[PDB]
Ligand binder design. Structure first.
Ligand SMILES: CCCC[C@H](O)[C@H](O)CO
Lengths: 108, 295, 120
């Protein structure tokens, strides 16, 4: 299975691009994704992916990545989403952790 | 007729004048008159300016820091003014620009009277106080209070001088933070709430510092046996943490206290380790080992 | 051999107690220290240690820890120090990484700034 053991950040600005350190159970650097998602009553989810190269996977037990941009960069209230590890080869996922996207401060 | 009733009716006698373009206007910092009055502790003036802003539904105007006048009063530790503001409907469930709720600010600073003010004001304004709100660090207000108290305790067991302006300040903050924690719990805060980063409970957080006063406080709660063996994301319990610590003068007693109040020494983490497997090498770890095995 | 691969914070408040994620080459959880240090003019050395328990060492390849308090919490300008891994058993050290201690920002809520303001 997959498991997120610790994350140094569980909130981020909707603009994305912010660096996060994630500690995990053993993964393989070319078979791992970090999936952000948000399930509305809808039929097809919103999703975004953590930005990192395989070299950012540290000794199979940690990943340093940048947050994806949230779907709406113009929100005025924080949006609660989820983050999970996903394996590319068999699409298995870790249990989801809550992640908070907060509004951008667009002045100066 | 109490004095406050006099100065209030007296206040409105002096500023039934201002009016409506001058106190709704914002400073370069975004501060209205109420923000400043609140910060200065002008209870009578704050009451009047608030009532006039409230009628226009402009009570919760935020400055450049994302702080309403109510949020400013919280930070300023003006619990009298706080209660006045929340009573007439000031939004309790809000954040500043750093993502902190008024409860979080109370928790960090140990403003228990402010916290009690919020509780009363919310009752008299039909507001729901979200005790489990998380800040941008994934922490509930209880979490913040515990971490703040750990820092105080850790320093008290380190600075070598009573007469210092800081230590007497630390001593009072030691008391105020515990009072704040008690208030939060009395208000219904979940001790078993987990930090979003690591899955630590308030008990876990206390155990990290071998914080005897808080460990004792939490373990006395009715739900003690329901969270004493709670596991963080890495599978560790508070007993795992206590047994493994860098040497503190209160480490042994923390382990004893956890054992005595029902912590399970056979619990295993993600790597199948029990607390006994985590003890430091040498005599100290041997002493901890006996406590974990002994009755 | 010891190595700090990367750290999620390269600066922190002089007050200490701030959580840092450090990624390292392989260490043993009971045999590792994180040492903040600063050479001083009289030839002495200030040192402070990261605060963590062995369980905060993640699978021998990462350490989550709290910063030490800097030697002087009253500085008005940031102070640069070095941070290194150190093995307790043989006192081998990693190459150092830069770390900046900055002054505590009192009254970030700007409470006192408002008290100084004037009104009609
Ligand atoms: C501000 C003093 C800098 C200290 C410096 O980082 C270490 O002593 C390097 O030897």
């Amino acid at each position: 299975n997959l498991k997120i053991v610790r994350m140094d950040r569980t909130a981020g600005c909707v603009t994305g691009g912010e660096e996060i350190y994630l500690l995990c159970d053993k993964v393989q650097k070319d078979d791992i994704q970090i999936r952000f998602y948000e399930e509305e009553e809808n039929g097809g989810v919103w999703e975004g992916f953590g930005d990192f190269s395989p070299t950012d996977v540290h000794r199979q037990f940690a990943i340093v990545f940048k947050t994806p941009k949230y779907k709406d960069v113009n929100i005025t209230k924080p949006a609660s989403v989820f983050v999970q590890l996903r394996r590319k080869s068999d699409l298995e996922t870790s249990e989801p952790k809550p992640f908070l996207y907060y509004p951008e401060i667009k002045d100066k | 007729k109490s004095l406050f009733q006099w100065q209030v009716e007296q206040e409105e006698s002096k500023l039934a004048n201002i009016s409506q373009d001058q106190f709704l206007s914002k400073d370069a910092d975004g501060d209205t008159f109420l923000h400043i009055a609140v910060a200065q502790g002008r209870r009578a003036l704050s009451y009047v300016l608030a009532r006039k802003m409230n009628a226009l539904h402009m009570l919760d105007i935020k400055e450049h820091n994302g702080q309403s006048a109510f949020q400013v009063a919280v930070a300023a530790n003006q619990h009298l003014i706080v209660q006045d503001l929340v009573n007439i409907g000031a939004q309790v469930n809000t954040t500043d620009c750093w993502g902190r709720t008024p409860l979080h600010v109370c928790a960090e600073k140990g403003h228990s009277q402010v916290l009690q003010a919020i509780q009363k004001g919310a009752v008299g304004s039909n507001q729901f106080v979200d005790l489990e709100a998380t800040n941008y660090d994934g922490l509930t207000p209880l979490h913040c209070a515990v971490i703040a108290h750990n820092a105080v305790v850790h320093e008290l067991q380190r600075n070598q001088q009573p007469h210092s302006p800081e230590v007497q300040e630390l001593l009072l903050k030691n008391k105020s933070l515990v009072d704040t924690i008690k208030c939060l719990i009395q208000m219904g805060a979940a001790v078993e709430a987990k930090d979003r980063k690591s899955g630590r409970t308030a008990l876990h957080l206390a155990a990290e510092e071998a914080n005897l006063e808080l460990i004792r406080l939490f373990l006395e709660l009715p739900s003690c046996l329901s969270f004493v063996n709670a596991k963080a994301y890495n599978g560790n319990t508070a007993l795992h943490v206590a047994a493994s610590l860098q040497y503190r003068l209160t480490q042994l007693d923390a382990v004893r206290l956890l054992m005595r109040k029902g912590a399970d020494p056979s619990t295993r983490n993600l790597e199948n380790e029990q607390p006994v497997h985590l003890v430091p090498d040498g005599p100290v770890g041997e002493q901890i080992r006996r406590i974990l095995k002994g009755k």
